[PDB]
Amino acid sequence: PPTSDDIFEREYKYGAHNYHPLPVALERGKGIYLWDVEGRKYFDFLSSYSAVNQGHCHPKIVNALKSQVDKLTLTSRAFYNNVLGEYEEYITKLFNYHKVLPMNTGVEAGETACKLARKWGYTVKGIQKYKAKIVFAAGNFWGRTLSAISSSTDPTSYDGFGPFMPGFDIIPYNDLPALERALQDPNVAAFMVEPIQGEAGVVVPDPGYLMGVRELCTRHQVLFIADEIQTGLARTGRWLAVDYENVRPDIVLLGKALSGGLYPVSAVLCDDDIMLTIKPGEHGSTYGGNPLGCRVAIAALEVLEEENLAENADKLGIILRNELMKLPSDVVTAVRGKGLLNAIVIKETKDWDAWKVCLRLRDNGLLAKPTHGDIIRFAPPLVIKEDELRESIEIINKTILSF
Amino acid sequence: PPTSDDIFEREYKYGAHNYHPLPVALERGKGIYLWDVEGRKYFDFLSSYSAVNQGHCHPKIVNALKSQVDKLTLTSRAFYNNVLGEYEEYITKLFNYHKVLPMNTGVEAGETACKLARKWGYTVKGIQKYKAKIVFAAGNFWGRTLSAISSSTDPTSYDGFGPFMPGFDIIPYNDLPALERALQDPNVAAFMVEPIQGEAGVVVPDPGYLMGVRELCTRHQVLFIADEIQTGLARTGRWLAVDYENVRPDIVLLGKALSGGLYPVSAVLCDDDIMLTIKPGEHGSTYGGNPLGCRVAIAALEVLEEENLAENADKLGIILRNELMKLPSDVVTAVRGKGLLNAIVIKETKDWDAWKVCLRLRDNGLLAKPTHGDIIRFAPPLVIKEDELRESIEIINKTILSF
Ligand SMILES: Cc1[nH+]cc(COP(=O)(O)O)c(C[NH2+][C@H]2C[C@@H](C(=O)[O-])C[C@H]2C=O)c1[O-]
Numbered sequence: 001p002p003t004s005d006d007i008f009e010r011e012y013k014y015g016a017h018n019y020h021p022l023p024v025a026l027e028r029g030k031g032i033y034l035w036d037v038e039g040r041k042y043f044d045f046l047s048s049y050s051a052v053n054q055g056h057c058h059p060k061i062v063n064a065l066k067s068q069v070d071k072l073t074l075t076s077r078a079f080y081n082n083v084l085g086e087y088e089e090y091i092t093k094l095f096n097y098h099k100v101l102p103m104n105t106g107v108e109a110g111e112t113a114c115k116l117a118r119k120w121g122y123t124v125k126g127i128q129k130y131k132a133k134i135v136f137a138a139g140n141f142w143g144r145t146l147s148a149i150s151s152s153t154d155p156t157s158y159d160g161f162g163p164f165m166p167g168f169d170i171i172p173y174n175d176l177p178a179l180e181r182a183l184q185d186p187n188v189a190a191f192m193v194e195p196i197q198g199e200a201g202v203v204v205p206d207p208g209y210l211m212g213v214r215e216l217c218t219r220h221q222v223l224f225i226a227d228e229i230q231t232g233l234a235r236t237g238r239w240l241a242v243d244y245e246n247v248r249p250d251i252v253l254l255g256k257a258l259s260g261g262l263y264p265v266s267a268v269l270c271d272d273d274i275m276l277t278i279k280p281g282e283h284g285s286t287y288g289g290n291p292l293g294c295r296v297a298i299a300a301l302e303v304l305e306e307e308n309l310a311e312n313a314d315k316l317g318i319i320l321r322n323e324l325m326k327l328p329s330d331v332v333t334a335v336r337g338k339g340l341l342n343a344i345v346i347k348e349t350k351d352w353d354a355w356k357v358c359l360r361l362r363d364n365g366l367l368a369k370p371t372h373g374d375i376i377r378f379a380p381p382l383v384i385k386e387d388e389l390r391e392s393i394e395i396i397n398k399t400i401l402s403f
Numbered sequence: 404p405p406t407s408d409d410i411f412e413r414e415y416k417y418g419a420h421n422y423h424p425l426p427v428a429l430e431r432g433k434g435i436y437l438w439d440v441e442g443r444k445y446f447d448f449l450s451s452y453s454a455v456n457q458g459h460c461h462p463k464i465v466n467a468l469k470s471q472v473d474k475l476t477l478t479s480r481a482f483y484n485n486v487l488g489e490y491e492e493y494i495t496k497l498f499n500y501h502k503v504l505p506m507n508t509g510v511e512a513g514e515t516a517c518k519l520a521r522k523w524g525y526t527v528k529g530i531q532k533y534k535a536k537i538v539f540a541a542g543n544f545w546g547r548t549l550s551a552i553s554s555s556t557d558p559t560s561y562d563g564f565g566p567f568m569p570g571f572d573i574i575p576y577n578d579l580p581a582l583e584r585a586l587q588d589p590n591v592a593a594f595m596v597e598p599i600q601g602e603a604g605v606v607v608p609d610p611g612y613l614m615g616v617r618e619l620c621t622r623h624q625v626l627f628i629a630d631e632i633q634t635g636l637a638r639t640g641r642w643l644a645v646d647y648e649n650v651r652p653d654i655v656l657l658g659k660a661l662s663g664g665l666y667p668v669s670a671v672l673c674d675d676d677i678m679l680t681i682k683p684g685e686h687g688s689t690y691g692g693n694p695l696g697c698r699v700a701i702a703a704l705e706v707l708e709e710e711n712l713a714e715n716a717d718k719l720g721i722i723l724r725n726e727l728m729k730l731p732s733d734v735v736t737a738v739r740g741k742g743l744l745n746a747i748v749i750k751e752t753k754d755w756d757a758w759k760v761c762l763r764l765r766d767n768g769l770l771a772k773p774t775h776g777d778i779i780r781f782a783p784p785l786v787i788k789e790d791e792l793r794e795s796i797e798i799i800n801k802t803i804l805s806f
């Protein structure tokens with residue numbers, strides 16, 4: 001029966017050192033709760049960066065996976081499977097776009113959007129071959145490929161990682177005058193932006209930012225790519241975070257909770273005039289659109305809809321933020337978020353930091369992760385109930401006030 | 404009860420047109436066989452580009468997936484799960500490298516290898532920041548990211564897809580004098596190469612090519628990255644295709660059959676002096692190393708070992724190629740491959756092509772895919788038996804000789 005310490009040391013030996021995780025070794029998860037190898041129980045306040053919006057191992061999603069794995073799991077796209085088309089019709093009708101392109105990981109959805117933007121740039125907009133530019137916001141995080149780190153302003157992402165992808169320009173987040181300036185160049189094909197920046201520390205832009213982005217993109221014939229990989233699927237209290245301002249992006253990226261954490265599924269949504277710039281043989285993925293992922297994804301979306309999780313995230317979010325704001329201003333300097341995507345900023349000294357807070361939260365039965373040594377994310381599954389939420393808030397209060 | 408035609412038309416409407424698949428709509432798979440929605444039974448001679456080496460829905464691998472999905476599926480790498488370390492110890496000991504870095508898709512494993520090569524280049528070799536070059540072989544295929552298409556010589560991969568990643572140089576495959584010439588530049592960090600090129604049409608290099616590559620890489624202080632995503636895990640009749648020449652690459656990429664097609668799992672293997680150039684916070688993936696994928700991967704490897712599939716692939720491969728060589732030289736111009744990774748080249752006219760052959764193979768109960776209009780791949784699951792193989796060969800003979 002391996003201990004928590006055994007688990008840590010074994011990984012140190014045989015695995016890459018590309019992470020420094022919070023020292024907790026989990027073996028079971030159900031709904032809002034996680035259990036470690038010692039049998040200790042925890043509130044999950046990370047939800048695997050929104051991948052388990054439905055709670056850990058939601059029985060509807062598990063039943064879909066169990067049913068389909070006995071039938072067929074992977075043919076490759078060399079042939080048709082019977083599930084993919086059913087999934088495609090369902091998701092396209094739900095989000096109201098003509099088409100979906102299926103992939104596996106969030107970064108793959110991002111790479112696909114970049115490819116679409118360029119191909120649309122050259123074939124429709126009329127940009128001269130390989131002059132196409134994509135604009136990004138500072139603080140952006142969309143993954144770990146050579147392309148994705150090329151748009152990052154985080155030195156931990158890019159430093160040491162070889163020459164960078166050309167054609168990627170960076171402007172400040174939440175800055176309409178900067179976007180307006182950037183879009184004067186007719187060689188800009190697109191702007192990719194997160195409606196709230198997750199990894200940057202739940203950076204919520206000013207009211208009107210999303211409608212301003214939509215207006216500028218349309219005016220200058222530029223694609224608006226919304227990365228809703230973390231913000232989508234009910235986490236902020238709507239189907240999409242862009243719904244708060246009734247904004248329709250050209251391209252929508254989804255991932256994470258698209259499978260309830262059971263399978264790496266991601267999706268790129270857009271209309272025919274953009275989607276069909278990519279011809280047969282010009283893009284894909286071995287596992288993209290496989291029948292098992294598709295069955296899981298259908299069930300995952302059905303859960304979000306059936307259980308009205310968006311409404312729940314909105315209602316409980318307000319409660320969470322209001323209670324967090326009662327913590328002393330000397331210790332917690334800001335509270336931010338929408339729905340159940342939230343964070344606090346702590347008054348870090350050399351004595352005390354976000355890591356130390358998260359260690360004590362763990363000791364008191366709640367799992368959260370810091371994102372810069374002063375930021376702590378609070379993001380439980382959307383299936384959490386009010387009494388469960390208030391019990392969690394009591395843990396958070398006990399912990400913060402115990403210093 | 405949707406028909407095959409319904410399935411095709413539904414995808415045409417709601418899905419991207421990034422594929423033109425063989426018109427067959429599958430709903431069930433078990434071992435070597437696939438069933439379409441009409442109930443027709445087929446030999447799978449593609450094996451999802453080697454992802455289902457173990458056969459479709461292998462019960463040992465399915466049982467691992469079913470057992471673990473009830474426990475825990477995804478925590479993210481913000482915390483530890485109990486499975487990952489067990490998987491890491493197992494795979495590292497099996498292939499005899501210090502460490503593994505887990506990812507999901509084949510292209511992600513490739514991106515990771517490129518990142519390692521660059522970081523090792525700058526930090527160990529002493530290359531000036533962002534002068535690091537990676538060399539690739541013409542005909543290479545490692546995925547569909549902006550980086551991956553940047554090394555491709557296939558216009559269908561790269562054309563229309565925006566400016567390219569700098570620092571990627573291309574030489575002819577199976578060409579030691581060319582490698583020797585390329586490696587004169589001290590800014591080369593690595594050479595990435597497939598031991599047999601899969602997507603290029605099962606291009607088998609000359610005997611001694613792999614040992615020559617190893618010798619040149621060592622001499623010029625350059626990393627040898629072997630992409631065994633398709634060739635690895637028993638498909639060619641050894642654990643790794645590089646085993647045929649007793650060659651130890653610096654970095655080994657694995658994917659596909661690493662999960663038996665049940666889950667997108669991929670792996671990057673290397674020793675500490677390379678692996679540890681990447682520090683905590685500098686690389687990762689949401690789903691990489693999740694407990695469900697790990698349980699599946701352990702079971703998938705155990706199958707390959709337990710059932711001696713490598714030995715089986717070697718024995719049956721010889722039989723397959725010898726029988727294929729009996730087809731008239733006027734109609735089939737070449738037979739090539741190792742183990743159960745094989746292909747034929749047909750004497751394409753304007754009357755007749757690889758697509759037409761694969762349509763008739765399907766009609767006669769065997770599923771294969773063409774790769775250039777003159778090349779047809781023959782790659783059944785490694786669990787196939789001799790009598791099953793000979794029955795398949797009879798289908799292939801009937802089809803070819805029916806024109
Ligand atoms: C908005 C958005 N867009 C694309 C992606 C790429 O998604 P993916 O990882 O599936 O490629 C992500 C993933 N965010 C992660 C990755 C992670 C790790 O441990 O690697 C830390 C974490 C916190 O933000 C994302 O938030």
Ligand SMILES: Cc1[nH+]cc(COP(=O)(O)O)c(C[NH2+][C@H]2C[C@@H](C(=O)[O-])C[C@H]2C=O)c1[O-]
Nearest residue numbers: 284285286508509510544545546602632633
């Ligand atoms: C040696 C090697 N190295 C890396 C990868 C990337 O793997 P991945 O797709 O998981 O990113 C592959 C995948 N080969 C595929 C992809 C495919 C599709 O339909 O996309 C057609 C097919 C035929 O070769 C590979 O053979």
